[PDB]
Amino acid sequence: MVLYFIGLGLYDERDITVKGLEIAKKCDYVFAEFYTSLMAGTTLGRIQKLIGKKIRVLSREDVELNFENIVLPLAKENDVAFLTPGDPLVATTHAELRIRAKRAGVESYVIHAPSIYSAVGITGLHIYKFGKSATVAYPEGNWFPTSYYDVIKENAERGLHTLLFLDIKAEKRMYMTANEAMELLLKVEDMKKGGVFTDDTLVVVLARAGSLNPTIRAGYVKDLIREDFGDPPHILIVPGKLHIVEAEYLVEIAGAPREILRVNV
Amino acid sequence: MVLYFIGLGLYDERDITVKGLEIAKKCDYVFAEFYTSLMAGTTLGRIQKLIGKKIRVLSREDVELNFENIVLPLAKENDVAFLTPGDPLVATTHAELRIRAKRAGVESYVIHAPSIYSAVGITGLHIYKFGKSATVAYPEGNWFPTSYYDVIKENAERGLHTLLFLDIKAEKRMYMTANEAMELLLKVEDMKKGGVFTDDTLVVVLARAGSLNPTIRAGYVKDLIREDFGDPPHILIVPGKLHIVEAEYLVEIAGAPREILRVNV
Ligand SMILES: Nc1ncnc2c1ncn2[C@@H]1O[C@H](CSCC[C@H](N)C(=O)O)[C@@H](O)[C@H]1O
């Protein structure tokens, strides 16, 4: 009679909360989805071993089209868990699944876990200064989406930071790198000429948040565009004007050039 | 030889990540602060029992003025952990403490935990639509903070949602309720008269996120301003223009007036 939405956290199998783990262990059935994002620091096998339960993976179609036929029927007479990378309901489509549960007469509860949305606090940038977020999508064919560029423009002009989720082909396990994102943004700038993203733009790259050894780098595009930030996933941030405290953290912790203390504050 | 900043999560001792727990259990010394937020579902005793270590609680003064005198000295010859509610670097000034650690020759690591900043996803509002955040602080003496009002105005004009952290005075055991926040906002409105926050404004309240049964309510200020949302902590949200699916969730899950389903495109 109960469905638990349980977050797996940021990177590996230990990023689930103690609450989420103990609840998952007591569930009769455990499902999981890895299409909204991936858990790059672990494997399905390691997650399964930790929980001690067989984990049935669901595709985007399984969920978006058949959640009420695959998961809810079992949740009617058993305790069922639905695992998702990060924090449940951060992904925009997740929330509606709770309405489906209600419609089916199934109680649902949410067990939170760390999300990249909040983990970016490790960049030293004040969380309150982050504005609207956006996703950099790979262009393809004759389709060249650029809405993320406008998001940076609107946030930056108001002195706010912009969190940029990078494209991911979950099924193929292909991650867009911060380098590719920077190249794309420079390409968009060359087309819109808005003066929003150039070689002189200060950016911050956060790779493998959740890991004990994440890569946190800050610097100008001209210097970071060909830099190796390590294995995925990568997150790109275009900060707005910096509070001196944010700048000092970027210099001392993220290796930012001293120049940001006089140019970006 | 190291200092760990470990988050404890949203509500109770089990909101800590497995990673955080396994590391905390092996540390030589464990310190913590409980003034940046309120974990309403646990006690120091329960946290100590879970981690299996004595926890030395520090006051805001101990941390802000003497972190380098109380904590860092031990981290030079021992494995030390510094625990905090939620995520250690979200809506706190703890990031700067990493700079102090560095200057002291102490390597530091960060272990994330569920944060209210991302837990708001449980309101059904799209996380990417949240703009700049703000804090509603208690007025004191002849000083009446009003900056949060301008944040709402700025976000709303852009169609973005506004997350409002509520004030906390841990030593006095005072936790601002969503009701008190709404009352303060109505007073600022009468002063600035910007038509930003009135009796007809739609708001969302999230109380005790992290618990299994948090209070999630949406409605007009005139109706919710005197409603009992249960024990603290509380957070207040002022939505911007709603997507149809956001409205549907607020109606179905947060008990919002069905009239909000009719969005004005
Ligand atoms: N479980 C919870 N439910 C509702 N609001 C919460 C909450 N935990 C924190 N808050 C809100 O956030 C304020 C503390 S701000 C510090 C937040 C913390 N670092 C985190 O990551 O969550 C509180 O005064 C309250 O308004």
Swiss-Prot record, chains A, B:
The keyword Ion transport does not apply. Pathway: Protein modification; peptidyl-diphthamide biosynthesis. It is an enzyme of class 2 (transferase). S-adenosyl-L-methionine binds at residues 10, 87, 90, 115-116, 166, 209, 234. The keyword NADP does not apply. GO terms for molecular function: diphthine synthase activity. It catalyses: 2-[(3S)-amino-3-carboxypropyl]-L-histidyl-[translation elongation factor 2] + 3 S-adenosyl-L-methionine = diphthine-[translation elongation factor 2] + 3 S-adenosyl-L-homocysteine + 3 H(+). Disulfide bonds: none annotated. This is Diphthine synthase.
